[PDB]
């Protein structure tokens, strides 16, 4: 399976080992569970944006970063890392960003990237598991 930059094959590959037989009896429910979880998190983020709660956004980013990391979903993990950082009021270089308005705008961009990358991956994973 050639998922491009979306998936770390060395990590995802280890998920696939847990399948007994060729029906993907373990990996497929797991991946499904991740997309549901992601979808829930994105909704809770979309609300957190609406209420301009930067700490919440930071934590949701960190949470979803961790679960995408576990499965090797690199592009999603990265965008969630940015949400974590911008939620703590920091730029990519580590310098502080004191303008909340700027932070929120950067989070919005990274949330859009995350959602789009999730959808892209969901499709490929659907092709893969059929």
Residue numbers in the entry: 44 to 173
The authors write:
If the HK incorporates a REC domain (REC-1) is denoted as hybrid histidine kinase (hHK), and the first His-Asp phosphotransfer event occurs in the same polypeptide chain. Then, HPt protein containing a phosphorylatable His shuffles the phosphoryl group from the phosphorylatable Asp in the REC-1 domain to the phosphorylatable Asp in the REC domain of an RR (REC-2) in two more phosphotransfer steps. In fungi, the HPt accepts the phosphoryl group from REC-1 domains of various hHKs upstream of the signaling pathway and forwards it downstream to REC-2 domains present in at least two conserved RRs, Ssk1 and Skn7. Also, we have obtained the crystal structures of Ct_HPt alone and in complex with REChHK6 bound to the phosphomimetic BeF3−, as well as the crystal structures of REChHK3 and RECCa_Sln1.
To assess that phosphotransfer from REC-1 domains was being carried out on the phosphorylatable H105 of Ct_HPt, we generated the mutant H105E and conducted phosphotransfer experiments with REChHK6 and REChHK3 in the presence of PAM. The absence of electrophoretic mobility shift for the Ct_HPt mutant H105E in the presence of PAM, compared to WT, alone or upon incubation with the REC-1 domains indicated the absence of phosphotransfer and confirmed H105 as the only nucleophilic residue to become phosphorylated. We determined the structure of the phosphomutant Ct_HPt H105E at 2.4 Å which showed a similar structure than Ct_HPt in the complex (rmsd of 0.7 Å for 125 residues). However, the superposition of the phosphomutant to the complex showed few clashes with residues of REChHK6 involved in complex interactions, thus, supporting that subtle changes in the side chain conformation of a few residues could prevent phosphotransfer. In relation to HPt, we have observed subtle changes in the phosphomimetic mutant H105E.
